[PDB]
């Protein structure tokens, strides 16, 4: 059973969310199995950012057990700006654990090195997710985002508990039940960083969302890269903390890491600067 342990108040620099397995903190990056059901390709998706929020929360590569923490910018919290007609993130945003976009080699489909992070997932169900949630999802497709020149695949998925889950089985079903969502997805990822002064992003395949079969192949590739990484066999792990508490045959295995985590110290959400309210027309 997966639960969360929150340190601090949301929207503060001290805020951390560890994922617990039977009450014990585990690595959100390495200890959560990629598959909830291997035979049926049902994946475990770690949610970082709830739909319509702005905080750039992420499984941290630099801290032990990789808790979800907010990224920083010039000493303060990092937030994505609202880009008309969108409000914050337009998907329950997260990643699949036990995956890695290898930054050491150039990926052929995109002709660029990976972004050094677990593969990303866009969960399109109706219910807004919570930070640290581990939900079970079906893969529907994938888009080849080049984010600031780096391979940055976006898997399109749906929570198996969603009322529409039974009807969503491949990429064509997203346009059938969520018309316009894919085009908006393409747009959002192209322009979301422009308010921060970054250039517009680009997609391979002219922004085409590849199907489930394709998605599964890429997911497997990123899972294989993580297998090499966690074994300590990457040519360069980029200082990522590979500490884990469920993989005994790995060099960085350490059960005590779980017991070192401070107890929950939940505090109510802290105020977010009103500047984040701003709607950008770009």
Tokens of 7: 């340190």
Among positions 73-102, residues that touch Mn ion (CB under 5 A) are 95
- Retrieve residue 111's tokens: 């002709």
Contact by Cβ (8 Å): 272, 14: no
**Beta strands 120-123 and 154-159: pairing type?**
parallel
**CB nearer to a second copy: pick between 84 and 205:** 84
CB of 93 to a second copy, least distance (A): 15
When the beta carbons of 163 and 251 are compared against a second copy, the nearer one is 163
- Minimum distance of Mn ion from residue 179's CB (angstroms): 26
Task: Compute the distance between CA of residue 149 and CA of residue 113 in angstroms, rounded to an integer.
Answer: 8
How many residues bind to Mn ion according to rule CB under 5 A? 6
> Is 152 a residue that touches Mn ion (CB under 5 A)?
yes
**123 sits in which H/E element:** strand 120-123
Which residue from 120, 159, 162, 221 is in contact with Mn ion, where contact means CB under 5 A? Answer: 120
CB of 189 to Mn ion, least distance (A): 8
214 is catalytic: no
Backbone phi, psi, residue 178, to 5° = -130, 55
Place of tokens 């780096």: 150
Q: Binding residues for a second copy, per CB under 8 A? A: 51-52, 84-87, 90, 126-128, 177-181, 184, 274, 277-279, 281
Cα distances (angstroms) measured from residue 156 to each of 10, 33, 161, 172, 181 = 27, 19, 16, 11, 11
84 contact choice in a second copy, Mn ion, none (CB below 5 to 8 Å, kind-dependent): a second copy
The catalytic site residues sit at: 89
| Site for Mn ion, rule CB under 5 A | 95, 115, 117, 120, 147, 152
């Amino acid at each position: 059973t997966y639960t969360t342990r929150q340190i601090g108040a949301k929207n503060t620099l001290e805020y951390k969310v560890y994922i617990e397995k039977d009450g014990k903190p585990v690595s959100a990056f390495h200890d959560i199995p990629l598959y909830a059901d291997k035979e049926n390709n049902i994946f475990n998706m770690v949610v970082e950012i709830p739909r319509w929020t702005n905080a750039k929360l992420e499984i941290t590569k630099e801290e032990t057990l990789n808790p979800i923490i907010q990224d920083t910018k010039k000493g303060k919290l990092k937030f994505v700006r609202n880009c008309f007609p969108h409000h914050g993130y337009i998907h329950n945003y997260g990643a699949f654990p036990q995956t890695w976009e290898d930054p050491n080699v150039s990926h052929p489909e995109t002709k660029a090195v990976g972004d050094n992070d677990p593969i990303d997932v866009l969960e399109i169900g109706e219910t807004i997710a919570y930070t640290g949630q581990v939900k079970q999802v079906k893969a529907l497709g994938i888009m080849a985002l080049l984010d600031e020149g780096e391979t940055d695949w976006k898997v399109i998925a749906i929570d198996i508990n969603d009322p529409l889950a039974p009807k969503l089985n491949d990429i064509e079903d997203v346009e059938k039940y969520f018309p316009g969502l894919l085009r908006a997805t393409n747009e959002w990822f192209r322009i979301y960083k422009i308010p921060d002064g970054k250039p517009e992003n680009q997609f391979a395949f002219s922004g085409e969302a590849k199907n489930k079969k394709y998605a599964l192949d890429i997911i497997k590739e990123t899972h294989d890269s993580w297998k090499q990484l966690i074994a300590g066999k990457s040519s360069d792990s980029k200082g990522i903390d590979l500490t884990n508490v469920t993989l005994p045959d790995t060099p960085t295995y350490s059960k005590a890491a779980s017991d070192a985590i401070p107890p929950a110290s939940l505090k109510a959400d802290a105020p977010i600067d009103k500047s984040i309210d701003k709607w950008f027309f770009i």
